[PDB]
């Protein structure tokens, strides 16, 4: 079996191996610095560390079983997978991470968990999982702030452990700056030790202060360096949140910039107030119903195959309901679907007038149109979604008395979304289909007779 890295099984294993990596990255230094934490729950640490080592071994097996892309295809040969895993630095990192340094537990005793710090060398795996999460989650900003919170909490936890270790090296309660005497019943509680160390670390690593001033020179140096790290950390939090705020509001900021630009244009051009109100209502409607993005610019990022398939899935049935395209070759229909151009109209907008040159076929997608009697107060017929007009005028039919010109005035009753196929687009598609061109000419002739 070969695990697809883009599959859900790979992401599930990413989480399943991230749990021991996070457990190591926090609790190894937590037990190394807080001796009471290691001593009190030593059996639990032994079970959890053995389980984490087993999951590390299974992670190496997964990496041997993880496929990769060559020639656009997932490599499923076992020997190639082994060679690809062993060639990378990650194999060396995994081997160094699973070096049996726990044997020093028999030498240095049960109070030295820092020998397991090599397990932290699985760190990249952890990062990979979160990277995949930022590609997979439907709430990228919530996950991003959670990721930042967790990384800041991990760094604060590490600095809390460092502060406790420095206090231990100097001496508990030897001065006012260090953690106080742990022989005291209140200060000697493990919960009190860890929580006050975390409080000190959070305060110093966020430019808050509110901690006893350092007394010794090494304490002054450590406080200075850790406040510099805290300035960096606070600036990192502020920059991450500011980038998040900019990114969430980027689409709204762009739409608002377009709003302000068009408003300034109609102020500067002395555009009539009714037209101004129509433009503002049009933009508000496009934003409210999530339509303001131009379809060509959105779809241009897609490849031609996916864009063509989406265009087919949107337009193929509607274009096949057209009576001039009722019985056509599939490729011609696909090309004509690709040649469709989106148009939008406000309520009261005139798509075409009588006497206008007709060079486009309009097909209604999400609107209502009306045929008016040159006055606009009466409507002959309302054309609903899926209807079309101008299918004859795009065909160059000889002997047509009403050809090349529009015979009816088409008014947009509301906000109508149409798709237009120009005559030039039809001819460009028909140069590759001569038989379809002749059939279209004959169909238009037969329609014009009746």
């Amino acid at each position: 079996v070969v695990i697809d890295p883009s599959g859900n099984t790979y992401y599930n294993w990413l989480f399943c191996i991230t749990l021991p990596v996070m457990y190591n990255w926090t609790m190894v230094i937590a037990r190394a610095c807080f001796d009471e934490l290691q001593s009190d729950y030593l059996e639990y640490w032994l079970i959890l560390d053995y389980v984490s080592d087993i999951v590390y071994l299974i992670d190496m097996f997964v990496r041997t079983r993880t496929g990769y892309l060559e020639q656009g295809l997932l490599v499923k040969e076992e020997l190639k997978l082994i060679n690809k895993y062993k060639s990378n630095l990650q194999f060396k990192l995994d081997v160094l991470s699973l070096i049996p340094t726990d044997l020093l537990y028999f030498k240095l005793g049960w109070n030295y968990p820092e020998i397991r710090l090599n397990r932290l060398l699985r760190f990249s795996r952890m990062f990979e999982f979160f990277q995949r999460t930022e590609t997979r989650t439907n709430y990228p900003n919530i996950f991003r702030i959670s990721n930042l919170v967790m990384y800041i909490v991990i760094i604060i936890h590490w600095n809390a452990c460092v502060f406790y270790s420095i206090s231990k090296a100097i001496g508990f309660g030897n001065d006012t700056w260090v953690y106080p005497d742990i022989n005291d019943p209140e200060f000697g509680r493990l919960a009190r030790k860890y929580v006050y160390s975390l409080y000190w670390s959070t305060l110093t690593l966020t430019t808050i202060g509110e901690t006893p001033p350092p007394v010794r020179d090494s304490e002054y140096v450590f406080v200075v360096v850790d406040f510099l790290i805290g300035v960096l950390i606070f600036a990192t939090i502020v920059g991450n949140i500011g980038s998040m705020i900019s990114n969430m509001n980027a689409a709204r900021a762009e739409f608002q910039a377009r709003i302000d630009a068009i408003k300034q244009y109609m102020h500067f051009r002395n555009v009539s107030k009714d037209m101004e109100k129509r433009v503002i209502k049009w933009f508000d409607y496009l934003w409210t119903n999530k339509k303001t993005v131009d379809e060509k610019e959105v779809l241009k990022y897609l490849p031609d195959k996916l864009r063509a398939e989406i265009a087919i899935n949107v337009h193929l049935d509607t274009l096949k309901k057209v009576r001039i395209f009722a019985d056509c070759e599939a490729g011609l229909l696909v090309e004509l679907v690709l040649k469709l151009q989106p148009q939008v109209y406000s309520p009261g907008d005139y798509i075409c007038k009588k006497g206008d040159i007709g060079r486009e076929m309009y097909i209604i997608k999400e609107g209502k149109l009306a045929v008016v009697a040159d006055d606009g107060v009466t409507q002959f017929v309302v054309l609903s979604d899926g209807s079309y007009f101008g299918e004859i005028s795009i065909l160059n039919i000889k002997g047509s008395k009403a050809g090349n010109r529009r015979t009816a005035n088409i008014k947009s009753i509301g906000y109508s979304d149409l798709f237009c196929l120009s005559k030039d687009d039809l001819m460009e598609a028909l140069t590759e289909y001569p038989d379809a061109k002749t059939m279209l000419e004959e169909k238009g002739k037969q329609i014009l007779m009746k």
Binding site: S243, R269, M275, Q343, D356, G414
Partner: protein, 432 residues
């Protein structure tokens, strides 16, 4: 009004403000009444009366105002009462309003009433749409959130003090003063991470202070990031204009362009930025829908272009295409729109400013002055290429804005319309 538009009705947005005020009363006074002892049995009637008023506003919102809201179906405004009611009932906003409306003397039992936040977002959207330069309000809105967080923080602190007894330690609230401004002061010193408070002693106090400071770091970061986004969005156009002008100035400095041409370019940049607020209008034009772009071009230039005798009797869509192909060009004072003897290839439509036609002996004589809305040089459009020369010097009296249509764009339009093309050739051979 039998049917009310949720977008453009001022009475509706006033009612939205009323619903927002009721929601704000719930959100700001549920934690106060839960934490602080301000909900005494002596003054319980004021709290009950205002809660009843807020619930009545909620009920009139869910029943009267929201069911009369017109909506958009298929791009059509729908004011049919049954359709309006069904659209409201199917909506998630009705579900949120029902979830807030249920009751569930304890102030925390009113916590469902805080779930009517969609009214707040709708009112915010209406406020952003109504008034220009909206980011200022956004700052206030962001500040409001900060205040509310401090408010929540304040209440939490009091509960923590009430969980440990007032004055039991130096960390908790002592018990003197207003008891809300003291807890709000603690919330300000913590949630802004200012510090200076009495240090926490017990494990509960240290945990509370740690979590409070952490939330304060992130809330202060949220406030700073919101203000940074506001500043970056407010000055984005000015920054873009300054960057374009500086890039142009650097270009002219690399090529040793003299001070006269550089000053003219800077003058055009400054005048364009101060007059139309954008360097290029066609960049905005291409972003619009084609119908909107066409109707704007019609509203700007159609009467003037259709007043021109050269294009009388021509097809209306060819006129519209010429309107779409018009380009706005700003000429500096004393600039030559047409030089005597140069090739005439452009149609000039004075959108703004004055244009002087020169003549007479030795030049420097103003034969005629053309104001805005006057068209000259359109005869040069109907030329074979090199067949038209400008007869008189034509100069810009001040900063004049002209809508220019050149011969190439007119020909590119004319190949589409054979009738108008034939009419223009007939007029060209008729006038000579």
């Amino acid at each position: 009004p039998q049917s009310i538009d949720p977008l453009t009705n001022l009475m509706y947005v006033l009612w939205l403000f009323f619903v927002v005020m009721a929601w704000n009363w719930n959100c700001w006074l549920i934690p106060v009444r839960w934490a602080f002892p301000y909900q005494t049995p002596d003054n319980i009637h004021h709290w009950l009366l205002m809660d009843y008023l807020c619930d009545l506003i909620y009920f009139l919102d869910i029943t009267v105002f929201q069911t009369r809201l017109q909506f958009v179906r298929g791009g059509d405004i729908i004011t049919d009462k049954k359709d309006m009611r069904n659209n409201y009932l199917k909506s998630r906003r009705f579900k949120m309003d029902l979830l807030s409306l249920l009751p569930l003397v304890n102030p925390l039992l009113r916590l469902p009433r805080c779930l009517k936040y969609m009214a707040f977002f709708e009112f915010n959207s209406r406020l952003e749409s109504i008034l220009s330069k909206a980011y200022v309000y956004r700052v206030i809105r962001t500040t409001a959130y900060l205040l509310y967080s401090l408010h929540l923080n304040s209440c939490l602190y009091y509960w923590a003090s009430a969980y440990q007894g007032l004055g039991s330690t130096h960390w908790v609230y002592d018990g003197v003063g207003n008891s809300y401004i003291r807890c709000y002061y603690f919330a300000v010193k913590t949630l802004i991470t200012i510090g200076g408070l009495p240090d926490p002693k017990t494990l509960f106090e240290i945990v509370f202070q740690l979590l409070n400071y952490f939330t304060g770091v992130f809330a202060f970061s949220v406030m700073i990031g919101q203000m940074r986004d506001v500043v970056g969005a407010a000055t984005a156009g000015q920054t873009y204009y300054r960057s374009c002008m500086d890039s142009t100035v650097k270009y002219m400095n690399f090529y040793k362009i003299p001070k006269s041409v550089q000053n003219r370019v800077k003058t055009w940049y400054e005048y364009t930025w101060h007059s139309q607020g954008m360097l290029d209008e066609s960049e905005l034009m291409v972003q619009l829908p084609d119908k909107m772009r066409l109707d704007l071009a019609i509203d700007v230039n159609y009467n003037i272009v259709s007043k021109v005798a050269l294009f009388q009797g021509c097809d209306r869509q060819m006129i519209f295409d010429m309107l779409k192909r018009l380009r706005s060009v700003v000429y500096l004072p004393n600039d030559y729109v047409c030089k005597k003897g140069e090739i005439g290839r452009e149609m000039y439509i004075i959108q703004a400013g004055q244009v002087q036609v020169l003549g007479g002996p030795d030049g420097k004589s103003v034969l005629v002055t053309l104001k805005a809305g006057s068209v000259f040089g359109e005869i040069s459009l109907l030329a074979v290429g090199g067949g038209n020369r400008r007869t008189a010097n034509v100069v810009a009296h001040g900063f004049t804005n002209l809508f220019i249509l050149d011969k190439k764009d007119l020909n590119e339009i004319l190949v589409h319309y054979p009738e108008s093309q034939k009419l223009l050739r007939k007029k060209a051979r008729r006038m000579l």
